[PDB]
């Protein structure tokens, strides 16, 4: 069917965090991930994605990612992943490389096109897919002990698919945004 878009997740991997050697402060960036087909399957459409955080907000911090097209600094919300002394911040963007990193500092924001945040009629150009880029950074909220800290898998939030044509917009299709657990080495 023309509106038979089906979701697929976007995730970052804890294992990509370098070894922490050192409040609150950023202790490292996970590898940025990309998925051109977070929503795929239907016919060509004008589409946009809205991210909704799923984790409690425990603080805020200024930061600039080294990975994405991040020119200025921004306010990020520190989210709780249920690990003492730790927190994470999120930044998202459209799949295409020129798009800007969208810091997550609210309960809802359009990650692509970023213009939809200031114009409710704005969608991406006609395409048969919607994708995203995911950036995550670990934050130490307090002095961390040396060793291996376990990080559980947590759903960081959800991308909601909106489209110009009402039938696809009415489906309200969503896809999950994931942090894949593992361990981090503090020294």
Residue numbers in the entry: 21 to 42, 50 to 214
Q: Which sentences from the paper describe this structure?
A:
Next, we determined the crystal structure of UclDLD from F11 at 2.2 Å resolution. At the time of collecting our data, there was no structural model with sufficient sequence identity available in the PDB. Thus, we used iodide SAD phasing, using a sodium iodide derivative of UclDLD that diffracted to 2.85 Å resolution, to obtain phase information. The final UclDLD and UcaDLD models contain residues 21–215 and 21–217, respectively. Electron density was not observed for residues 43–48 (UclDLD) and 44–47 (UcaDLD), suggesting that these regions have a disordered or flexible conformation in the crystals. As expected from the high sequence identity, the two structures are similar, with r.m.s.d. of 0.6 Å for 189 equivalent Cα atoms. UclDLD and UcaDLD have a completely conserved pocket in the same region of the structure as the N-acetylglucosamine (GlcNAc)-binding site in F17G. Of the 358 glycan structures present on the array, UclDLD bound specifically to four glycans. Overall, SPR analyses revealed the strongest binding interaction occurred between UclDLD and sialyllacto-N-fucopentose VI (KD = 11.72 nM ± 3.6). In particular, the swap of asparagine 192 in UcaDLD to a positively charged lysine residue in UclDLD could be the reason for the increased binding affinity for sialyllacto-N-fucopentose VI via its negatively charged sialic acid.
Ucl fimbriae are attachment organelles that facilitate ExPEC adherence. Ucl fimbriae are phylogenetically related to Uca fimbriae from Proteus mirabilis and F17/G fimbriae from enterotoxigenic E. coli (ETEC). Tip adhesins are two-domain proteins; they possess a C-terminal pilin domain that connects the adhesin to the main fimbrial shaft, and an N-terminal lectin domain that mediates attachment to specific ligands, therefore dictating host range and tissue tropism.
